[PDB]
């Protein structure tokens, strides 16, 4: 009953693979719903076509800016920002899916995928899902990042939706 969404990742237009996520709707229903709906395009805007603007090998992959495409933008389905729903779930390891923000209660659409345990982010970012399949694709994505996060190739979500 927890929903599943997929990203089809491309590298400079070339298909790399699919990453799928379980969204923890049972534990963070509002945050899960935001990410779910942005993945299908059913609100008239969303993740499709946007890039991962910041990738830091060993740390995380961040994307979700489909409004400005420069890492400063994005929006939720609820208006511009919504609340940190809760901090029940932790950044326990690679594959953890978590909301980026700009301070308390500023969730929009930007998100990140952990490539390691990042317990120092616990209580600071709302965890709301986990890579289900395709962790090997996220690892492949890492190779195009850098210690400062800038990417050496355009890493995009060529398609996305609900499974
Ligand atoms: C360009 O972004 C601006 C600045 C954050 C940016 O300046 C170059 C600073 C980057 C610092 C990078 C060090 C690596 O850490 C990250 O990348 C983190 C990891 C968790 C998710 N995340 N980004 C975030 O949630 C970060 C803030 C952050 C940074 C470090 C740790 C942390 O817990 C949160 N927000 C953002 O990326 C938001 C957008 C969601 C609008 N951006 C803003 O508020 C600003 C406009």
Curated annotation (Swiss-Prot):
It catalyses: [protein]-peptidylproline (omega=180) = [protein]-peptidylproline (omega=0). The modification Phosphothreonine is found at residue 92. PROSITE patterns: CSA_PPIASE_1 (PS00170), CSA_PPIASE_2 (PS50072). Keywords: Acetylation, Apoptosis, Cytoplasm, Glycoprotein, Host-virus interaction, Isomerase, Isopeptide bond, Nucleus, Phosphoprotein, Rotamase, Secreted, Ubl conjugation. Its EC number is 5.2.1.8. Binds cyclosporin A (CsA). CsA mediates some of its effects via an inhibitory action on PPIase. The modification N6-acetyllysine is found at residues 27, 43, 75, 81, 124, 130, 132. The modification N-acetylvaline is found at residue 1. The modification Phosphoserine is found at residue 76. Changing residue 54 to A: Loss of peptidyl-prolyl cis-trans isomerase activity. No loss of its interaction with BSG/CD147 or its ability to induce leukocyte chemotaxis. No effect on its interaction with MAP3K5/ASK1. One of its GO terms (cellular component) is extracellular region. Changing residue 125 to A: Loss of peptidyl-prolyl cis-trans isomerase activity and interaction with HCV NS5A. Loss of ability to stimulate MAPK/ERK phosphorylation. GO terms for biological process: activation of protein kinase B activity; apoptotic process; cell adhesion molecule production; cellular response to oxidative stress; endothelial cell activation; leukocyte chemotaxis; lipid droplet organization; negative regulation of oxidative stress-induced intrinsic apoptotic signaling pathway. Residues 6-162 form the PPIase cyclophilin-type domain. InterPro entries: Cyclophilin-like_dom_sf, Cyclophilin-type_PPIase, Cyclophilin-type_PPIase_CS, Cyclophilin-type_PPIase_dom. Acetylation at Lys-124 markedly inhibits catalysis of cis to trans isomerization and stabilizes cis rather than trans forms of the HIV-1 capsid. PPIA acetylation also antagonizes the immunosuppressive effects of cyclosporine by inhibiting the sequential steps of cyclosporine binding and calcineurin inhibition. Acetylation at Lys-124 favors its interaction with TARDBP. It comes from the Eukaryota. GO terms for molecular function: cyclosporin A binding; heparan sulfate binding; integrin binding; peptidyl-prolyl cis-trans isomerase activity; RNA binding; unfolded protein binding; virion binding. Glycans are attached at residue 107. CDD domains: cyclophilin_ABH_like. There is a cross-link at residues 27, 81 (Glycyl lysine isopeptide (Lys-Gly) (interchain with G-Cter in SUMO2)). There is a cross-link at residue 27 (Glycyl lysine isopeptide (Lys-Gly) (interchain with G-Cter in ubiquitin)). Interacts with protein phosphatase PPP3CA/calcineurin A. Interacts with PRPF19 isoform 2 (via N-terminus). Interacts with isoform 2 of BSG/CD147. Interacts with FOXO1; the interaction promotes FOXO1 dephosphorylation, nuclear accumulation and transcriptional activity. Interacts with integrin ITGA2B:ITGB3; the interaction is ROS and peptidyl-prolyl cis-trans isomerase (PPIase) activity-dependent and is increased in the presence of thrombin. Interacts with MAP3K5. (Microbial infection) Interacts with HIV-1 capsid protein. Catalyzes the cis-trans isomerization of proline imidic peptide bonds in oligopeptides. Exerts a strong chemotactic effect on leukocytes partly through activation of one of its membrane receptors BSG/CD147, initiating a signaling cascade that culminates in MAPK/ERK activation. Activates endothelial cells (ECs) in a pro-inflammatory manner by stimulating activation of NF-kappa-B and ERK, JNK and p38 MAP-kinases and by inducing expression of adhesion molecules including SELE and VCAM1. Belongs to the cyclophilin-type PPIase family. PPIase A subfamily. This is Peptidyl-prolyl cis-trans isomerase A. It comes from Homo sapiens (Human). The gene is PPIA.
